[PDB]
Amino acid sequence: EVKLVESGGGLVQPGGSLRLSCATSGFSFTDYYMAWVRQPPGKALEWLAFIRNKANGYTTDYSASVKGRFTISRDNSQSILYLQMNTLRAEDSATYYCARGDYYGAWFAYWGQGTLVTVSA
Amino acid sequence: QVLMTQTPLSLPVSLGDQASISCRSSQSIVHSNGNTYLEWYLQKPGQSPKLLIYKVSNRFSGVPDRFSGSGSGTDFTLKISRVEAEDLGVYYCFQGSHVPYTFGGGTKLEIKR
Amino acid sequence: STSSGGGSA
Ligand SMILES: O=C(O)CCCN/C=C1/N=C(c2ccccc2)OC1=O
């Protein structure tokens, strides 16, 4: 049913951009809150930026750790979520996941398998 | 920003014993509407995290009864009546009602004796 | 490195 797949991460050089993507399957993509959580090989899960559904005018909020660099977006026709990351760095190397809110008080009801990024060579 | 501070860092248990993870916020985590978007997740070794309890105490469909959360305020606590081997992993509490949304540092739930 | 390469709110 619900399928969330990420892709676009890889080995990048300090500074410089990259564009992550998440494909959707099994749900009217437009009616749901979406996010990007990040877990550096290190430890803790870290919410980066979130995008809401048509019901909420597709608003968007970001952590400050990516406030100006990273930028979220959503292809409502193709049902895909993107995360453009710019001037990457060290603390950026991590497995980036895709998440979709639940019809109730829940932000991450469905996570993707996650895609890894490594920046520091 | 309001950070979550969950303890203990590591929680050793024998399969079958109850387990209790705490999560002290650092300030009221009540949204403008009436909710407290405090959630729990279980990330098993090398495996995306799962949603366990969304509002301070609702149990996400598919998660077994063993799990339950609670305690509105600044102190929230996740409890598991009997811990199966498949419960072992790292639990994180997530604060979802105040931007910048935050996670706890986690609390590994490994086998004790 | 390869080619051509309190305080809380
Ligand atoms: O369950 C119904 O089938 C499904 C869809 C309902 N619209 C609600 C959605 N509600 C949220 C949401 C995300 C965080 C807190 C409160 C609500 O994300 C969504 O995609």
- Residue type at B30 in one-letter notation: V
Asked if the A1-121 domain carries CATH number 2.60.40.10, the reply is: yes
Rg (chain C; Cα; Å): 18
Domain regions of chain A by residue span: 1-121
Strands (E), chain A: 3-7, 11-12, 18-25, 34-39, 46-51, 60-62, 71-75, 80-85, 94-102, 106-111, 115-119
Main-chain phi, psi angles of B85, to 5 degrees:
-55, -40
Q: Which residues of B touch A97 (CB under 8 A)?
A: 48-49
**What is the rounded distance in angstroms from the CA atom of residue A34 to the CA atom of residue A31?**
10
Closest by CA position to B17, among listed B89, B93, B94, B111: B111
Provide CATH code, domain B1-113. 2.60.40.10
Coil, strand or helix at B105 = coil
**What is the rounded distance in angstroms from the CA atom of residue A31 to the CA atom of residue A24?**
12
Model resolution, angstroms? 2.9
CB of A84 closer than 8 Å to CB of A10: no
Burial label, B83 (beta-carbon count in 10 A; 0-12, 13-18, 19+): buried
Q: How many Cα atoms occupy the beta-carbon half-sphere of B9 within 13 Å?
A: 2
Closest by CA position to B58, among listed B88, B38, B87, B31: B38
Nearest to B49 among A63, A106, A111 (CB): A111
Coil, strand or helix at B56 = coil
- Residues flanking ligand 1, CB < 6 Å: A 31-33, 53, 101, 103, 105, 107; B 37
Tell me how many degrees the CA angle A3-B103-B18 measures, rounded to the nearest 5.
90
Distances (CA, A) of B4 to A39, A64, B98, B104: 16, 17, 11, 5
